[PDB]
Paper text:
Neutralizing antibodies (nAbs) elicited against the receptor-binding site (RBS) of the spike protein of wild-type SARS-CoV-2 are generally less effective against recent variants of concern. In the receptor-binding site (RBS) of the spike (S) protein receptor-binding domain (RBD), the B.1.1.7 lineage has acquired an N501Y mutation, B.1.351 and P.1 lineages share this mutation along with K417N/T and E484K, whereas the California variants have an L452R mutation that is also present in the Indian variant B.1.617 with E484Q. We therefore investigated the structural and functional consequences of such mutations on neutralizing antibodies (nAbs) isolated from COVID-19 convalescent patients, and their effect on angiotensin-converting enzyme 2 (ACE2) receptor binding. We and others have shown that most SARS-CoV-2 nAbs that target the RBD and their epitopes can be classified into different sites and subsites (9–12).
Numbering used by the authors:
A (entry chain Z): 334 to 527
B (entry chain Y): 1 to 95, 95A, 96 to 215
C (entry chain X), D (entry chain W): 1 to 52, 52A, 53 to 82, 82A, 82B, 82C, 83 to 100, 100A, ...
E (entry chain V): 1 to 27, 27A, 27B, 27C, 27D, 27E, 27F, 28 to 214
């Protein structure tokens, strides 16, 4: 009854960062080695916990949030960061405990003519709270006149599409990101190591 | 409304030549730049979307690039079917859609001076109270040509209309007609009627004159 | 595949309204914005607005906000553009064009399919056949020279007039200029042809002018001048 | 499973730049943050800073921020600690330590890089006898630079009762040391006692015989 | 920044006996997320890099003997060596990794305690060889003593010397757990030939009264 981390990391399709996906992992035995002994990853940043010891530990739940961003924004998926992704799309708390794993997916998420299916939120009335997901598609009102649901003067589309082209520089290429959060409640622990 | 600056207004090139067209986009928080081609009597046809990507069925010779607010449409080698008008369009928030002024890509050829002819008003129109004097400039290139009407050596203003044909299928020349319209009384009050043509192919302006009542 | 078919040409008076339809086929109607774009004679392209065929909401251009109305019938996959309080400078070709919709984001793919266009002529003039006058060849001739002659087709409405020469047997050297709109509101046009001077005595030259809206057909022979 | 290897000993002059390295080898290096710890002679550990080699995210302690530069070459799994102009107070051992994640312990340590910044230049030691008169004898190994110096007795054949004292940094900026040995005083007349001193930086090898002094 | 302090600074305890080291934190290092104290204990032997013993205040690293135990919470932590072994003679550091910048305790030295042993005192005059370079080195050697604390007073014609002496000490010996110490008095030859009596006075717990070893310059 291994934990279904394969269906998270090896998922054929990933979500947009504004609509980031969450998979709850529970009642499972996990082998985190397969993750931290892999050579397929570009970023593997852990916070408040050692992955090398995750197989000796137990947890109530593990949340696996996955999405796609561009390379130069992977730095934003960390506690205490700012910018469009951290403010408007996916925000980590200061007391984050878990790991942030990313790898270049240019061969999968870019295509000739551009892949415009991956979007991120460009405007918002306020910064997101930790782990808040906003899938609003309302025209952003930047001025005094209501927008009446259409784009116009001082009223902008809230979401912006990534221009993923195979010729993009590496910092503008798509990167698939998986954020593992480890939850310990005053309850039985159901995600454990071998 | 706002119009995007397309440059130049007219591009005169030979078949097989490289074509470079410029469009200066307005300032925008976010926008998409597209290029369309329009032939006479047809709807525009999408060539390029997002400044750089060929639309479906667009030949490989068409390409596009963009830096800052300057966007460029390139045709690596012009084909006969490529001579047409080209419009940049910007999709944005405000305005939601903006169009450029258009660039006409015409066929460059050797300079040809126009054959200038003048036609007095027919007897059948004088039998109806109006006089139409016609000036024909035949098979010339380039298209730029100044036509001026003179009645008793006095330059006319605001009483003439011009018509130009499209570039000829065979010799790629233009033809122009300028028609001066007056009342019959005003026609009969004067003698000399002259059409004066200035064109790059003429070492000096050519004047075609007739007196009222003269045969030719 | 994807196809946008518009309704036929219209002629209206400077107070009326016009309603152009645009039937979409070969794709899911509710997926794409329907924009309307107009082009005046010899002018560029001007955006009029878009409609969301799914919700029915619209976004009108600044120039036409107040007298343009865009509607849709999804059951027949048809968009409608009504322009009210028409003026003469509303005379133009009107195109429908589709553009894919993206919830919450600007469309990146542009207007990829257009309709064939609908000519709308707004004028206070009524239907009138043209008067055909000769543009007679010059009576002065050289042995190698070329002569010019033609037909002035004056004071007709509406467009178009078709001009041929010798029942279509004379095409070489023929120039039928685009019509011009006169201050009176009527159209005028000239068709000319260059021929050998030699030929003037032997060859009959006749211009065939046809104006179908007024059912006017005139075959005018242009003759050398009796000096 | 993960190992850190540091560059070798450094002996520099005040004002010179320096860049020492720490290379990782083994599985799971992608998860490791590499910190730098300073230990001045006879003192404790001071955390200077840390870097994640994957994106070169760098954190410094306020006492070393702006004094040193920590960087990383991820293509060769290497972290770097560098100075632009060295001071005498920079003389210390520098350890690279590794922890698989921020807010994690340093479970992997390098062997350490010894750094000596001094006005002094290379110089070989003068060896003087500490003559007996059980008795004690020895050798005073004075005025050498830099460390280290190796001292044996009878080329390793005499080990029992030998105490080689740690070098002291004298006034002179040069080190001095003593190696003593306790012997039966019967020994003195017929047994031969040789201190073999080697100062490899100067390429010096001095073997000296210590005997009772004549009056 | 979180300040750590250790107590005591030095610790001497017999083979197989108990050793206790306290670490105080100026700030809580407990994360209530996973209910763990972000406190680690490291051991460093002479010439060796530090070695991680305990993490999360109470969790032993793999391969650490059970005789090392970590305890405590909040701001009070303790490392307990039940049954001290010879291998465990070392300096021990607590460190917090709750938040960067990471900080260490000042370190606690742990050595073997043994019965009192008085030193063997020897004195060495400067060689004539060294004298002919212009400097006189007088050496005092204390051999195989315990505890390490001792006093070594240099006296030149019964005048006490100050600021002209250097002391060096060996580590605790492998076999007998004793120390040896050298005190070197360095001076110019000009100020060595000015006096006659050179004496080294050693005060130690193993001696009922201080032992003086002396020699007269110009005499054997
Ligand atoms: C993803 O697939 C690869 C190759 O099939 C496999 O080696 C890897 O373990 C998979 N990932 C997970 C998390 O199982």
């Amino acid at each position: 009854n291994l934990c279904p981390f394969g269906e998270v990391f090896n998922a054929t399709r990933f979500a947009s960062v504004y609509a980031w996906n969450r998979k709850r992992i529970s009642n499972c035995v996990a082998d985190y080695s397969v993750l931290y002994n892999s050579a397929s990853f570009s970023t593997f940043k852990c916070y408040g916990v050692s992955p090398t010891k995750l197989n000796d530990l137990c947890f109530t739940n593990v949340y696996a949030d996955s999405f796609v961003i561009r390379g130069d924004e992977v730095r934003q998926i960390a506690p205490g960061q700012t910018g469009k992704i951290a403010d408007y799309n996916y925000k980590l708390p200061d007391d984050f405990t878990g790991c942030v794993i990313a790898w270049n997916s240019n061969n999968l998420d870019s295509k000739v003519g551009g892949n415009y299916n991956y979007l991120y939120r460009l405007f918002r009335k306020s910064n997101l709270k930790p782990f808040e997901r906003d899938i609003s598609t309302e025209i952003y009102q930047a001025g005094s006149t209501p927008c009446n649901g259409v784009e116009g003067f001082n009223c902008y589309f809230p979401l912006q599409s990534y221009g993923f082209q195979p010729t993009n520089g590496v910092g503008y290429q798509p990167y698939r990101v998986v954020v593992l959060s480890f939850e310990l409640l005053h309850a039985p622990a159901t995600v454990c190591g071998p | 409304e706002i119009v995007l600056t397309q440059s130049p207004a007219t591009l005169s090139l030979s078949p097989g030549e490289r074509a470079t067209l410029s469009c200066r986009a307005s300032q925008s928080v976010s926008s998409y730049l597209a290029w369309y081609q329009q032939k006479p009597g047809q709807a525009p046809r999408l060539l390029i979307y997002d400044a750089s990507n060929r639309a479906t069925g667009i030949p490989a010779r068409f390409s596009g690039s963009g830096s800052g607010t300057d966007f460029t449409l390139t045709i690596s080698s012009l084909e006969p079917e490529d001579f047409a008008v080209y419009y940049c369009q910007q999709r944005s928030n405000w305005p939601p859609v903006t169009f450029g002024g258009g660039t006409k890509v015409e066929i460059k050829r050797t300079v040809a001076a126009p054959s200038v002819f003048i036609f007095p008003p027919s007897d059948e129109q004088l039998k109806s109270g109006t006089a139409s004097v016609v000036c024909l400039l035949n098979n010339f290139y380039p298209r730029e040509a100044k036509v001026q009407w003179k009645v008793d050596n006095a330059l006319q203003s605001g009483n003439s209309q011009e018509s130009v044909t499209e570039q000829d299928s065979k010799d790629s020349t233009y033809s122009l007609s300028s028609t001066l319209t007056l009342s019959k009384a005003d026609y009969e009050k004067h003698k000399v009627y002259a059409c004066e043509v200035t064109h790059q192919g003429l070492s000096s302006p050519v004047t075609k004159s007739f007196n009222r009542g003269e045969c030719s | 595949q994807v196809q946008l078919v518009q309704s036929g040409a219209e002629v209206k008076k400077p107070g009326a309204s016009v309603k152009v339809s645009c039937k979409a086929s070969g794709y899911t109607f509710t997926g794409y914005y329907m924009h309307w774009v107009r082009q005046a004679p010899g002018q560029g392209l001007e955006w009029m607005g878009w409609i969301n065929p799914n919700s029915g909401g619209t976004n009108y251009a600044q120039k036409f906000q107040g007298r343009v109305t865009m509607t849709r019938d999804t059951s027949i996959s048809t968009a409608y553009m009504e322009l009210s309080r028409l003026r003469s400078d509303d005379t133009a070709v009107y195109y429908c064009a589709r553009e894919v919709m993206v919830r919450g984001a600007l469309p990146p793919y542009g207007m990829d399919v257009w309709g064939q266009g609908t000519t709308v002529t707004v004028s206070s003039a009524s239907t009138k056949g043209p008067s055909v006058f000769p543009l007679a060849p010059s009576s002065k001739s050289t042995s190698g020279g070329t002569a010019a002659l033609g037909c002035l087709v004056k004071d007709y409405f509406p467009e178009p007039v078709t001009v041929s020469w010798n029942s279509g047997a004379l095409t070489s050297g023929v120039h039928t200029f685009p019509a011009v709109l006169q201050s009176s509101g009527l159209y005028s046009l000239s068709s000319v042809v260059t021929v050998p001077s030699s030929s003037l005595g032997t060859q009959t030259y006749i211009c065939n002018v046809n104006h179908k809206p007024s059912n006017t057909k005139v075959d005018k022979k242009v003759e050398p001048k009796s000096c």
